[PDB]
Amino acid sequence: QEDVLAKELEDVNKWGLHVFRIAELSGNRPLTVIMHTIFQERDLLKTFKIPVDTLITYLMTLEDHYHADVAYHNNIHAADVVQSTHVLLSTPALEAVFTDLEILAAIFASAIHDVDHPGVSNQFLINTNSELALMYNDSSVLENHHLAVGFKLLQEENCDIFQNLTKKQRQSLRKMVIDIVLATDMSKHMNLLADLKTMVETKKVTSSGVLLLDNYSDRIQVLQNMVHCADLSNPTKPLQLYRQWTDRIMEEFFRQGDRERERGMEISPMCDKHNASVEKSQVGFIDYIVHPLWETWADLVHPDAQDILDTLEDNREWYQSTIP
Ligand SMILES: COC(=O)c1cc(Oc2c(O)ccc3cc(-c4ccc(OC(F)F)c(OCC5=CC5)c4)oc23)c[nH]1
Ligand SMILES: [Mg+2]
Numbered sequence: 001q002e003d004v005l006a007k008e009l010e011d012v013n014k015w016g017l018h019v020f021r022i023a024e025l026s027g028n029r030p031l032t033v034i035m036h037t038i039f040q041e042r043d044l045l046k047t048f049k050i051p052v053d054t055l056i057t058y059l060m061t062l063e064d065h066y067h068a069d070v071a072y073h074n075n076i077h078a079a080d081v082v083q084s085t086h087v088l089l090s091t092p093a094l095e096a097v098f099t100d101l102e103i104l105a106a107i108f109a110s111a112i113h114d115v116d117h118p119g120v121s122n123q124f125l126i127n128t129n130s131e132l133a134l135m136y137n138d139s140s141v142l143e144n145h146h147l148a149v150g151f152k153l154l155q156e157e158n159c160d161i162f163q164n165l166t167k168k169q170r171q172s173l174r175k176m177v178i179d180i181v182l183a184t185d186m187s188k189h190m191n192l193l194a195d196l197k198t199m200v201e202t203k204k205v206t207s208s209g210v211l212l213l214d215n216y217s218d219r220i221q222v223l224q225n226m227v228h229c230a231d232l233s234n235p236t237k238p239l240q241l242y243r244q245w246t247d248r249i250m251e252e253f254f255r256q257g258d259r260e261r262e263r264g265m266e267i268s269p270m271c272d273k274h275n276a277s278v279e280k281s282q283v284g285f286i287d288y289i290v291h292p293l294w295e296t297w298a299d300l301v302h303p304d305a306q307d308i309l310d311t312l313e314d315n316r317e318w319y320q321s322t323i324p
């Protein structure tokens with residue numbers, strides 16, 4: 001097995017890594033081994049004096065606090081967002097733009113960004129007067145909680161992978177991570193896309209032709225949108241991966257609707273197993289959310305993302321062709 005796993009980890013720099021095979025081959029530890037691989041690949045253990053055993057201990061505890069009984073928002077999803085972010089960090093239009101602290105902030109943010117997700121939406125948790133929504137006053141309920149858990153687990157035994165950062169490093173990292181995770185709230189998609197379009201309209205390059213980011217506001221905005229794109233990258237992946245991500249999100253929404261049934265609440269969109277239209281939902285999802293976002297990202301990093309935009313469009317075509 002470990003030879004086969006090691007073989008698959010050779011694709012970690014590739015869009016469309018078989019994240020599901022890696023989950024099998026690593027014994028349901030995709031998040032731990034893809035993070036480990038990426039930290040070695042970016043030489044982050046030595047840059048930040050992260051002890052290897054501390055890194056593994058933390059990664060396994062983090063992976064544990066993703067719910068294995070949740071169909072979509074589990075550790076496989078987290079592994080895939082970490083790995084997609086890692087590919088997007090390497091894009092040529094971003095070369096040498098981001099410090100190693102920002103690279104670590106982004107990768108860390110991706111890893112924790114959905115931890116302890118209960119498999120239901122913010123709105124469901126607001127609507128059922130959950131403790132989470134009560135704790136967080138109905139605003140970015142899950143995303144605040146993923147942050148709260150991601151950081152808290154650093155305090156478990158031999159889990160503080162940031163123990164050797166400077167105090168100023170930790171401070172900057174923490175703020176960047178919060179700023180990134182809070183931006184994965186889907187209720188902020190339109191605004192984040194709006195601001196990203198504005199950045200593309202006013203884009204500035206360097207003498208190297210690489211993107212020019214003067215200040216925290218612009219730099220965190222690019223990392224926010226990057227991890228957001230990675231979060232919304234399932235329909236840009238090879239169709240065999242895309243389809244399995246759809247099967248998983250559909251099952252999670254369907255389970256939520258059932259909970260909405262046993263409560264007399266109305267069923268949210270796309271959550272009713274007796275009134276589903278999965279293909280048309282994917283096409284609408286691509287047309288109104290996913291393709292607008294990625295087209296904008298593609299203009300930002302043009303032409304670095306063309307093959308990704310290609311696959312999205314092919315996949316969009318294909319989901320259309322299966323519509324009755
Ligand atoms: C609050 O904002 C929304 O409700 C909005 C976002 C989105 O719902 C989501 C969230 O609120 C928060 C996180 C997520 C992730 C996905 C998602 C992921 C993959 C999908 O299909 C494929 F890519 F695998 C997917 O399909 C969307 C759909 C059926 C209509 C949704 O949808 C999410 C649809 N409506
Ligand atoms: Mg989320």
Ligand SMILES: [Zn+2]
Pocket residue numbers: 077081113114184231
């Ligand atoms: Zn996510």
